[PDB]
Amino acid sequence: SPVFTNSTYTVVVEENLPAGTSFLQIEAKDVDLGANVSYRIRSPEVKHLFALHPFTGELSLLRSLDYEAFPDQEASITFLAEAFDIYGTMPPGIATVTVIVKDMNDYPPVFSKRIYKGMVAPDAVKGTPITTVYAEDADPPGMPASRVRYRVDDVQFPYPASIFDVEEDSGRVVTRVNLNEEPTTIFKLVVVAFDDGEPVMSSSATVRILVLHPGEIPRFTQEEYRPPPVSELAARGTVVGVISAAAINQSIVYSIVAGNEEDKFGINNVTGVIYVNSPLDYETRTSYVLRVQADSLEVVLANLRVPSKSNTAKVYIEIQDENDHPPVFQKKFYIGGVSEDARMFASVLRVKATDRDTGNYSAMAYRLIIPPIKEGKEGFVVETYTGLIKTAMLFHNMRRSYFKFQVIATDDYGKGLSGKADVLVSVVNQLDMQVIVSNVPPTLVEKKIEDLTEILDRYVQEQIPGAKVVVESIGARRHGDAYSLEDYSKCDLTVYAIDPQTNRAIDRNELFKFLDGKLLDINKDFQPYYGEGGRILEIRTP
Amino acid sequence: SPVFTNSTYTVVVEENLPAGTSFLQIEAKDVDLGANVSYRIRSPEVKHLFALHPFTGELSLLRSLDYEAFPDQEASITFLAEAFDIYGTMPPGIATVTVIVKDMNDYPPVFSKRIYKGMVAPDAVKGTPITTVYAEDADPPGMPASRVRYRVDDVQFPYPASIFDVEEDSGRVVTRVNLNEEPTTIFKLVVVAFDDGEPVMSSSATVRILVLHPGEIPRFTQEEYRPPPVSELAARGTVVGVISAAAINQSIVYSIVAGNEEDKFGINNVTGVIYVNSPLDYETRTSYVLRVQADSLEVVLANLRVPSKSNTAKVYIEIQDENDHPPVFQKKFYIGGVSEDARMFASVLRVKATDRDTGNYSAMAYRLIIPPIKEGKEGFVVETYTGLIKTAMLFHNMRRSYFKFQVIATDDYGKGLSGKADVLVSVVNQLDMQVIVSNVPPTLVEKKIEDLTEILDRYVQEQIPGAKVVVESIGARRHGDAYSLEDYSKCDLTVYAIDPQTNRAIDRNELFKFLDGKLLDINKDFQPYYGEGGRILEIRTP
Ligand SMILES: *[C@@H]1O[C@H](CO)[C@@H](O[C@@H]2O[C@H](CO)[C@@H](O[C@@H]3O[C@H](CO[C@H]4O[C@H](CO)[C@@H](O)[C@H](O)[C@@H]4O)[C@@H](O)[C@H](O[C@H]4O[C@H](CO)[C@@H](O)[C@H](O)[C@@H]4O)[C@@H]3O)[C@H](O)[C@H]2NC(C)=O)[C@H](O)[C@H]1NC(C)=O
Ligand SMILES: *[C@@H]1O[C@H](CO)[C@@H](O[C@@H]2O[C@H](CO)[C@@H](O[C@@H]3O[C@H](CO[C@H]4O[C@H](CO)[C@@H](O)[C@H](O)[C@@H]4O)[C@@H](O)[C@H](O[C@H]4O[C@H](CO)[C@@H](O)[C@H](O)[C@@H]4O)[C@@H]3O)[C@H](O)[C@H]2NC(C)=O)[C@H](O)[C@H]1NC(C)=O
Ligand SMILES: *[C@@H]1O[C@H](CO)[C@@H](O[C@@H]2O[C@H](CO)[C@@H](O[C@@H]3O[C@H](CO[C@H]4O[C@H](CO)[C@@H](O)[C@H](O)[C@@H]4O)[C@@H](O)[C@H](O[C@H]4O[C@H](CO)[C@@H](O)[C@H](O)[C@@H]4O)[C@@H]3O)[C@H](O)[C@H]2NC(C)=O)[C@H](O)[C@H]1NC(C)=O
Ligand SMILES: *[C@@H]1O[C@H](CO)[C@@H](O[C@@H]2O[C@H](CO)[C@@H](O[C@@H]3O[C@H](CO[C@H]4O[C@H](CO)[C@@H](O)[C@H](O)[C@@H]4O)[C@@H](O)[C@H](O[C@H]4O[C@H](CO)[C@@H](O)[C@H](O)[C@@H]4O)[C@@H]3O)[C@H](O)[C@H]2NC(C)=O)[C@H](O)[C@H]1NC(C)=O
Ligand SMILES: *[C@@H]1O[C@H](CO)[C@@H](O[C@@H]2O[C@H](CO)[C@@H](O[C@@H]3O[C@H](CO[C@H]4O[C@H](CO)[C@@H](O)[C@H](O)[C@@H]4O)[C@@H](O)[C@H](O[C@H]4O[C@H](CO)[C@@H](O)[C@H](O)[C@@H]4O)[C@@H]3O)[C@H](O)[C@H]2NC(C)=O)[C@H](O)[C@H]1NC(C)=O
Ligand SMILES: *[C@@H]1O[C@H](CO)[C@@H](O[C@@H]2O[C@H](CO)[C@@H](O[C@@H]3O[C@H](CO[C@H]4O[C@H](CO)[C@@H](O)[C@H](O)[C@@H]4O)[C@@H](O)[C@H](O[C@H]4O[C@H](CO)[C@@H](O)[C@H](O)[C@@H]4O)[C@@H]3O)[C@H](O)[C@H]2NC(C)=O)[C@H](O)[C@H]1NC(C)=O
């Protein structure tokens, strides 16, 4: 008589476990005779899953349990078990068996990809986003056992795992510490996905973390650039030089941030050739301080500028001197006078021309264009590198004649633009000059004769508008009352003036009554160029 | 009749546990009547430790167990327990109770100090030693339960704990990752000491990690230094300038590594004053490229140099021009000649003096020291800023007389060292000169008269050792056979020479037979200074 000890059993059965595990012991006993009580289940669907020993009574697995193999309309599963005998002893017992399936991990978690990629900064702050690692569930949801959980392992790769820690719930790969490493290094970050239920099933993946590409800090060929000097006659398009910087496998974009407030130079963005954008002159500034910046391709692509000190260079562009302006004269009419007895190599006048803005020159070559002169003679010539006009030939018996010539001035020994001025040379004798007798030694007269010439010019130009005083000769005191020699320590200063209104001789009686008419002012205005000495004694006709 | 179920019990008893825990149930039963079996221990030393209920039989603690409270001569502890009754039923039972004490943590671990200090590098590599954290055991040793174990906790300080990990067995605090942080930041690293036994007892400590002190990279006041120019007359001790660099709270030690291979300059190590170590001249180099290094105090103390690019500056020291050398003359004897009829402002000679190494000058002032001259007259004077000697007075009826004067030369209009040379001036008339008749126009003679003077000097110095040819005057062709005028397009070149051996006149017949004796070579050597023209026709006495 097989009877059951208890009619209802309730056992929570773990699913997806490997076969061979025994869970429950169901026991029935024969009252009359026998310990060979046999067990049979009235459920064909769990015969594949469970295997029940018909002699001991242990319930073991033949195939691993699947909750989806059961109908989904039952949150509690109940079947029936009968018990028989070999001979067939009666009464037969009827009991109920309730199998409770625990809801946990069914399939191991599967990653979406095998290999992931990312990028980090060499100075990445705490919490920098890199990439997203996500795996599928392969699990009927609705419980915290269907939620993936991420962590790092340092038993095989301690260097990536101690630096980059994956967030627990979101799976975001952030920076746990501030890293300080070398670029172009590929790490192996093994991330193990696991759930939070019974026997944990897990897999492995690989996260390939490359840092960046170098070429971040540009290296100039020269810290301070000095091009060769460019001419002041340069126009738009003149290449004054080129700047160059080197970086590891990156393109360099150049730009000018300061130094061209007058908008004089420009640079190409992809090459670095600095060319003239507006013509430079000597009236403007002659030296510039240009600030050239060099940037990598990665910071231009990410709208940044390189945060270094060695990204700034200085360019000094100096302007050289060329031919730009024609020479100008001090006066357009240079007036001098020569005597009839004046041999060759005699000093006449000093023609001086200056450039208005050009200072390259050291000496200027002068040329003369001559009108024809009588008796087959030839006119004046001038020294080349000096400009000092000399007397060419003797001019005997020529009264009030004037020899007008033109001086051609061109800088740097002659190449380019030209200028022209007029030179008036008069011929004089004793019938047109006068002798001023002074009480001064001859040493005070000679070393400052041009200043005394200018002061006598200021004297003579007050009485008649327009005069040029030319000192012909200086001598000792020999022009007295009876033309005798009295004192060897005094002087006869022969002073002559030329009227530019007629380009001819001024009468000697006119200059006589001019210089004798203002004597009390002439004796006072002759003061500052003394040195020492006395008064002006008299003025005598030669 | 109280009898025991079993005579010997063996229970491993946990030590140092809080009181109230029950471990063993000892059971005795009365055969006749009673369930109130009472228990008494025969050990006075465990009465403080253990408390035994005389009605139920549970063994609970009254005081926590100490292994040192027991005698140390027993590795196994055994006492005796009797059992009585209220009425005193017989036979009494005798049993043995063996108490086994488990050997684990007795006292919690105690640190040696509360606060520890350390220092780290801003670029510290993996495994950099910092400090030593060590705690006492407070435990009788001889088991792995008396070994301390260190780990970090990131629940309250995630930033220090994720960066610095303490070694497990040695307690050495190393760098787990490469840190990249800011200086002067004090961290709080809580290290919890724990053993590897039963109920873990633990305490807490604090590790104060300061990084370093800044001032590592020096900042120059100028990247490129240019002192004002120093004189060439400077000696040892002249301060040409000073260099300065700034750092955060650190001292700067200066040194020169390149630029002074001739050992010209030196610098003070604690201030930066650059002074002259050897006198600089213009014969040496005029511009230097000095490389000045600035180092922090921490790298000098640790025998290092700062690993930057902005630790190098360039110093350009330029030398200005001062008075160093006296002026030298081209020749110590300048020889010229004047006529008897030579008025004032007449060109005589050009005295030229140059400095041997000084190039500051633009014009040189000359002075004359005169011997006394007859008739109350006064001697020669010279122009100040030119050096051109002019004729002072007329020299009538003076035959073969020479007027020797001395020229004083001092650069920069006169301040300092002086020089002296001799000047010989002779007086000539028509009785000592000669006339050379040539077939050349006058335009070819005047512009190159000094070169023709040098060629005539080379002519005359071949016949007599020592002569100086001075061209007195140039004229048109008027010295013929009968002293008549024939051609106005030809020249009379009056050529005169002075003998320095007597400082007097050379005879005109001597120069006549000199220049007439070598005529076929003179007509060929006169070639390169033509321009154009013909031959030399004749030589006629004036
Ligand atoms: C800027 O750009 C330049 C040029 O573009 C880069 O230079 C190249 O760098 C790559 C990467 O390192 C080189 O590619 C590899 O070269 C190896 C040759 O090894 C040499 O050097 C080692 C160490 O000194 C010697 O022992 C050896 O004998 C060689 O002399 C190859 O063996 C590699 O092939 C292997 O790897 C690849 C990729 O994994 C596989 O597909 C192959 O099948 C093989 O397994 C590889 O080709 C390249 O040679 C470099 N070029 C030059 C001209 O030097 C710079 O690196 C870059 N700058 C930075 C900072 O990255
Ligand atoms: C180095 O890099 C710099 C900066 O990147 C360059 O400067 C840029 O140059 C481009 C090319 O000219 C500019 O792009 C164009 O800008 C025009 C703006 O016109 C201004 O200037 C004119 C003349 O002074 C004024 O009359 C006018 O009012 C504006 O003030 C736009 O109108 C252009 O758009 C037209 O052309 C494009 C292309 O054909 C069409 O698609 C459009 O629909 C439209 O018809 C054009 O965008 C740019 O603006 C400049 N940037 C700056 C900041 O100024 C340098 O040129 C470069 N160096 C070299 C040598 O190339
Ligand atoms: C800006 O400034 C620079 C430098 O100051 C000027 O260059 C000078 O130009 C002048 C004029 O040409 C030079 O002066 C002359 O130099 C001659 C040297 O000749 C050289 O070149 C020729 C042709 O290549 C060669 O055949 C020869 O062998 C030489 O290598 C001298 O021989 C000249 O002297 C002669 O002429 C003068 C005047 O007529 C006479 O008085 C002399 O006795 C002699 O017969 C003359 O000195 C000068 O040398 C140049 N300087 C330099 C440093 O080269 C630029 O010209 C100026 N810019 C402009 C636009 O003009
Ligand atoms: C190079 O050397 C200079 C000078 O030696 C240093 O400058 C000093 O730095 C220290 C440390 O920071 C300063 O000391 C502290 O100053 C506090 C004043 O706080 C001011 O600033 C805050 C923030 O702007 C304002 O809110 C506030 O109102 C003040 O204006 C004091 O409050 C501090 O006292 C507290 O801390 C100490 C130490 O823990 C305790 O003992 C006190 O009881 C109190 O709790 C402290 O004194 C100092 O003031 C700075 N001096 C100057 C002149 O500025 C540089 O820091 C150094 N360079 C580097 C890189 O470190
Ligand atoms: C900036 O910093 C530099 C480097 O630190 C300094 O150079 C050092 O200067 C000190 C001070 O003179 C030197 O110390 C002494 O060196 C002597 C070596 O003598 C040499 O030179 C002499 C003269 O040319 C030779 O005759 C001789 O043979 C050697 O070649 C030692 O003899 C000294 O020791 C004696 O003096 C000390 C102190 O009194 C005693 O304790 C000793 O027992 C012994 O009697 C002394 O050590 C040092 O050597 C220099 N360093 C280098 C690398 O040369 C600069 O001086 C400093 N700038 C300034 C302005 O101070
Ligand atoms: C290295 O080179 C420098 C620059 O080339 C020299 O400095 C020059 O020195 C000379 C000589 O003294 C100067 O030439 C003269 O300058 C006078 C200007 O006087 C100034 O100074 C005085 C005193 O402080 C003031 O009272 C006055 O108001 C002025 O401020 C001119 O007046 C001079 O001209 C007079 O003398 C000459 C010669 O006799 C006459 O021909 C004139 O007609 C006039 O009467 C004279 O020009 C020159 O100016 C200085 N240059 C500069 C830029 O200052 C250094 O001297 C030299 N080194 C050495 C060691 O000598």
Numbering used by the authors:
A (entry chain A), B (entry chain B): 821 to 1362
Report text from the authors:
Hair cells have a characteristic morphology and harbor actin-filled stereocilia ‘staircases’ in which the stereocilia are coupled by protocadherin 15 (PCDH15) molecules from one stereocilium linked with cadherin 23 (CDH23) molecules from an adjacent stereocilium. Upon movement of the stereocilia induced by fluctuations of the surrounding fluid, the PCDH15-CDH23 ‘tip links’ trigger the opening of a mechano-electrical transduction (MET) ion channel at the stereocilia tips. PCDH15 belongs to the cadherin superfamily and consists of 11 extracellular cadherin (EC) domains, an extracellular linker (EL) domain, a single transmembrane (TM) helix and a cytoplasmic domain. Here we demonstrate that PCDH15 forms a robust complex with LHFPL5 and that the assembly is composed of 2 copies of each protein, thus providing concrete evidence that the composition of PCDH15 in the tip link is a dimer.
To screen for interaction partners of PCDH15 we created a PCDH15 construct where we deleted seven of the eleven cadherin repeats as well as the C-terminal region that differs between isoforms (PCDH154EC), arriving at a PCDH15 complex that retained important regions of the extracellular, transmembrane and cytoplasmic domains yet that also possessed monodisperse biochemical behavior. Imaging of the PCDH154EC-LHFPL5 complex by cryo-EM using a Volta phase plate showed particles composed of a micelle-shaped feature with two emerging strands, where the strands adopt a range of conformations. Analysis of these particles, deemed the ‘straight’ conformation, by 2D classification yields classes consistent with two cadherin chains adopting an approximately parallel configuration (green). We proceeded to carry out a 3D reconstruction and computed a reconstruction at ~11.3 Å resolution of this straight conformation. The two density features protruding from the micelle are ~190 Å in length and ~20 Å in diameter, consistent with an approximately linear chain of four cadherin domains. At the base of the protruding density, proximal to the micelle, is a disk-shaped density that appears to be formed by the C-terminal part of EC11 and the ~100 residue EL domain. We were unable to fit this conformation of EC9-EC10 into our density map and therefore fitted EC8, EC9, and EC10 as independent rigid bodies, guided by the shape complementarity of the rigid-body docked domains. We observe a dimer interface between the two cadherin strands formed by the C-terminal half of EC9, largely defined by a loop between β1 and β2 strands and the N-terminus of the α-helix between β3 and β4. This interface appears to stabilize the straight conformation. The model shows that the 4 cadherin domains stretch 220 Å above the membrane, with the EC11-EL domain positioned ~27 Å above the TM region. The cadherin domains have a right handed twist of 23.9° from EC11 to EC8, consistent with a right-handed coil of the tip link observed in high-resolution EM imaging.
